[PDB]
Point group: C2
Chain length 169, copies 2
Amino acid sequence: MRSIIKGRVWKFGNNVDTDAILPARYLVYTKPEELAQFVMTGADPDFPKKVKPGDIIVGGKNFGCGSSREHAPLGLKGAGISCVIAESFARIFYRNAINVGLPLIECKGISEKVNEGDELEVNLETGEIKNLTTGEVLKGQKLPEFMMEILEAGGLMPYLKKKMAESQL
Amino acid sequence: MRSIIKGRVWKFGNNVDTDAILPARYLVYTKPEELAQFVMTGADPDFPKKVKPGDIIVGGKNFGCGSSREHAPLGLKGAGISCVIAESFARIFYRNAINVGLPLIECKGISEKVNEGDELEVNLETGEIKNLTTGEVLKGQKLPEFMMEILEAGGLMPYLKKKMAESQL
């Protein structure tokens, strides 16, 4: 589980909905490997041609808004997106993402301080964000240790297996 | 569940271990109603005679330290402890507590700004803590909305129940 993430940024704006992230026509697919091929194609039909595993997505307010669509974060995960940093996240998208093991970070003002193509360093444990391209540094909201453990585990289900293997009732 | 908890404080010190919280001789019990009767009896054998449901526990550093003992936060929960606020918590206790629906908040310096018997108002969502009998306002670490959801569900199992009940895949 890399606590500290360095990657180049793909940028998206406000109210980017689950249709932008994973179009309805791909709901036929349930595997992350399949879904990875179609990430963000609602917003940019060529996106899967540009993105590389390890890249970071930066979004505006209310990223992932819309009704539940687990395929959306599952696809980002499958594509190797290292994390998503946004001004804010829709609530359903947010929990779905943490539970599939996709790190998310809220950072007010991120939209003003990062450009598409910039290189970022993100410390998940502290929320500190460094724009390497520009030298600017920001303070996002850290992931608490409790949530780092879920992420480190790979998501909720593998998290559960570990917790149950260690129980005693 | 309340975003805001108000309660009178019971105070304990540093490195309060799982034996202080729920002594080993009580491991024979698995129900919260039973364990409730013996909360904190390692540190204060009369504690169950004083504590009332809704009361808050304030702890020093490394509260809940020791090997995994699920009974310890289960007993606190069973006793109706509304919240535990500490300078810091042991990792294992911390996850065991959140996973049985027991709200925890970390607040550096809480030990010096609260007396036993003081009345506190704790905002779980922002982490802001008002010492009502003192007027002082302290800043604890907020529980992220993701964890608020687990607590609002009553713990990990009831959370999982609803999450699969809401699943598409």
